[PDB]
Design a protein around this nucleic acid. Structure first.
Ligand SMILES: *O[C@H]1[C@@H](O)[C@H](n2cnc3c(N)ncnc32)O[C@@H]1COP(=O)(O)OP(=O)(O)O
Ligand SMILES: Nc1ncnc2c1ncn2[C@@H]1O[C@H](COP(=O)(O)OP(=O)(O)O)[C@@H](O)[C@H]1O
Ligand SMILES: [K+]
Ligand SMILES: [Mg+2]
Ligand SMILES: [Zn+2]
Length: 678
RNA sequence: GUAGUAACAAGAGUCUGCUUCUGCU
């Protein structure tokens, strides 16, 4: 309720009407600073003008959190405060919420769509726009789509633009190596948001430092297993699988050779590149093309899972890596299970007895995992009230760590929670926002559930109880990530421990510390510039971007991406709402089969009904979903990643991961056209 | 369906990833 002195300081450039970037630590009260700026803004409007304020948040939970904050603060003062996100875009009309509210809180895509659809024509409808996590204003991020529009209006110079406020804990350094390059990076970000001043705590630092304690860092380098018989057995299986592939087809006319760097990210990326090349193989004999493509698809999928298991074993237990394989092979056994699949499964099952034996050898436990357990034991022994956030990179690793921490509870009583990002498409892994909230509620209040294991979903945004320990388990990243994760343990006495067996990860954390100091010094040098100097720099970058932006601004058969069977013509596709690609006609119904959808999501007016698969029982490739839409109970919606495209002109096959390059040649859905097909 | 100056990169004479992760609609 009562503003801190550093908060009044941070607010000053914005109160004086300048577009301002507030750079200050996570949890230091930047949102409250924006509230101060808003109060002043409302009270100092020129005559005949009423303020209209929009607050943008990148994440639905942050939208909800900040909407509640603005409601509580400003409704008592007679102000109308409303929110729009994807949830309520079905009920809500955007223009009318804007008309009726003094403050709108939104996710940015809501606005983008309302410009796209002509509902909104000018950003001059707002007098103040507040960008939470404004460092996201880059590329084709929704933030940068909106600011591009702002700058297009600014260039046409026939309108009053809203004042801009950006909130961030880190402006970043980009790829800079020195203070000069860092300054350029920071001016770049400022240029995208039309910033006129950067506001940091400079006069009231000792107050700031009282509220925000940088957690104490520990970087622990640990050893790998002395011997790795599990890795040797899997690596040999991988070698044999590559040799099998080469007997099926000379893949080195299609992709390069592997370096046999099994169990690395480089090998992963190699498999995925090789998969792409294999699926684009073309032969005169279409039967043989299908047979070879399918076989190579299978070989590469198997190589991938072995590579995955190696990586799991490096970070977790042998039994975790083995579990992952046995669950994969169960899936293989229940699928098409063609001869090649039976063979690969039998080759694994030959080794399985020995692998099981290896997985019970306690003397070869993962040293990194042992260190992690010692860390947690020490923490909870010292302070039973500890709450810990344990970060790890992959869904698979977080799942393995959950299993470890549940089978073997810390001090035989601490229980883990798990937080992952949302399940995408058909993923059994992943969590809805309600599930996410449930986990965090338990973590916040439970007596024994005092450990949260998380992917990057926990980095920032969603409200999490303060943690006095944060453990980064092989969890490296850039200086902005470093800075954000600090906000999870910003309580006096908090600690942050990084555990790795990799000297590169240690070196990475050293470089982050150097970058953060470089970033802070660059900001200081920029703040010595007068307004004239700053504005001239930002104008120059804006014109460069304008000129770049300006100088940028055939019929195909779709074939199953696995077995190469004919699916449909581009002529048959219709686009719904610029996004969803349906296929018309009776012919196409012969080409696919369906099963009930496991998770009947709704979105953009569709009821998900079924999953859609290649009709070839020896293939069963996932092609998309079927939906109900309007008066139509059964529409197939294809996903571009499931197919290879073949030019009816050249006969050449191509790969597309987005529809963008193709959409131009496709017709839009027309309810009248559709209505006539029944 | 789409985004990321997030991950991890590997390549091409500043451009490129569909992988990892997360976000949004
Ligand atoms: O190409 C896909 C899209 O047109 C549509 N779809 C699926 N998921 C989404 C989300 N999250 N937002 C917008 N549009 C979506 O469905 C097409 C098929 O995708 P997929 O087969 O992966 O759907 P799924 O239900 O996840 O299996
Ligand atoms: N002056 C203040 N008095 C009381 N609580 C404050 C004050 N400033 C910030 N807080 C609290 O600190 C927390 C973090 O503030 P927030 O604005 O969300 O931080 P940031 O946006 O910098 O991450 C919030 O719960 C907020 O209520
Ligand atoms: K068939
Ligand atoms: Mg990197
Ligand atoms: Zn198929």
């Amino acid at each position: 309720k009562k503003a801190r002195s550093y908060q009044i300081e941070l607010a000053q450039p914005a109160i004086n009407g300048k577009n301002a970037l507030i750079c200050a630590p996570t949890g230091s009260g930047k949102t409250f600073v924006s509230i101060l700026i808003c109060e002043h803004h409302f009270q100092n409007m020129p005559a005949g003008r009423k303020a209209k304020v929009v607050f943008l948040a990148t994440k639905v939970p942050v939208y909800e959190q900040q909407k509640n904050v603005f409601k509580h603060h400003f409704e008592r003062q007679g102000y109308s405060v409303q929110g729009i996100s994807g949830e309520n875009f079905s009920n809500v009309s955007v223009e009318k919420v804007i008309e009726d509210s003094d403050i709108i809180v939104v996710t940015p895509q809501i606005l983008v769509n309302s410009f796209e659809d002509g509902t909104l024509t000018s950003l001059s409808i707002f007098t103040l726009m507040i960008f939470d996590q404004c460092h996201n204003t880059t590329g084709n991020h929704p933030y940068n789509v909106l600011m591009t529009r702002y700058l297009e209006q600014k260039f046409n110079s026939a309108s009053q633009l809203p004042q801009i406020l950006g909130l961030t804990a880190s402006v970043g350094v980009g790829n800079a190596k020195n203070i000069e390059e860092t300054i350029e990076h920071i001016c770049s970000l400022c240029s995208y948001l039309d910033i006129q001043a950067i506001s940091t705590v400079r006069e009231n630092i000792q107050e700031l430092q009282r509220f925000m304690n940088k957690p104490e860092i520990d970087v622990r380098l640990v050893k790998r297993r002395i011997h790795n018989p599990f890795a040797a057995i899997i690596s040999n299986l991988m070698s044999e699988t590559e040799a099998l592939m080469r007997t099926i087809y000379s893949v080195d006319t299609l992709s390069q050779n592997s370096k046999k760097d099994f169990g690395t990210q480089n090998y992963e990326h190699w498999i995925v590149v090789t998969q792409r090349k294999c699926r684009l193989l073309q032969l005169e004999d279409k039967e043989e093309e299908s047979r070879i493509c399918r076989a190579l698809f299978i070989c590469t999928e198997h190589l991938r899972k072995y590579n995955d298991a190696l990586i799991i074993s490096e970070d977790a237990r042998i039994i975790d890596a083995l579990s992952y394989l046995t669950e994969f092979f169960t899936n293989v056994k229940n699928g098409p299970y063609t001869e090649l699949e039976q063979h690969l499964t039998a080759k694994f099952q030959e080794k399985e007895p020995e692998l099981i034996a290896l997985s019970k050898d306690e003397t070869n436990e993962n040293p990194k995992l042992e260190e992690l357990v010692c860390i947690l034991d020490d923490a909870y022994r010292y302070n039973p009230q500890t709450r810990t956030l344990l970060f790890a990179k992959t869904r698979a690793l977080v799942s393995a760590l959950k299993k470890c921490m549940e089978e073997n509870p810390i001090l035989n009583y601490i229980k883990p929670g798990v937080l992952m990002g949302r399940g995408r498409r058909d993923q059994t892994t992943g969590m809805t926002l309600p599930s996410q909230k449930g986990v965090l509620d338990a973590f916040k209040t439970s007596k024994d559930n005092r450990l949260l294991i998380a992917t990057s979903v926990a980095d920032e945004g969603i409200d999490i109880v303060q943690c006095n320990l944060v453990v980064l388990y092989e969890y490296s990243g850039n200086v902005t990530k470093m800075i954000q994760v600090r906000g999870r343990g910003r309580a006096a006495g908090s600690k942050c421990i990084l555990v790795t067996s990799k000297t590169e990860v240690v070196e990475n954390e050293k470089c982050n510390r150097y970058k953060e100091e470089m970033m802070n010094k660059a900001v200081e040098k920029i703040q010595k510039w007068d307004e004239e100097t700053f504005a001239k720099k930002i104008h120059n970058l804006q014109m460069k971007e304008r000129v770049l932006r300006d100088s940028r601004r055939g019929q195909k058969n779709l074939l199953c991406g696995k077995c190469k069977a004919y699916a449909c013509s581009t002529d048959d596709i219709r686009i719904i709402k610029d996004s969803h690609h349906i296929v018309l006609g009776e012919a196409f119904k012969e080409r696919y089969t369906t099963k009930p959808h496991k998770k009947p999501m709704q979105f953009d007016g569709f009821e998900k009904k079924s999953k859609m698969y290649c009709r070839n029982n020896n293939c069963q490739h996932d092609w998309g979903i079927t939906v109900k839409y309007l008066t139509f109970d059964n529409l197939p919606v294809i996903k571009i990643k499931s197919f290879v495209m073949e030019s009816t002109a050249t006969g050449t096959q191509m790969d597309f991961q987005k529809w963008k390059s193709i959409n131009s040649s496709l017709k839009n859905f027309d309810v009248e056209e559709m209505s006539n097909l029944y």
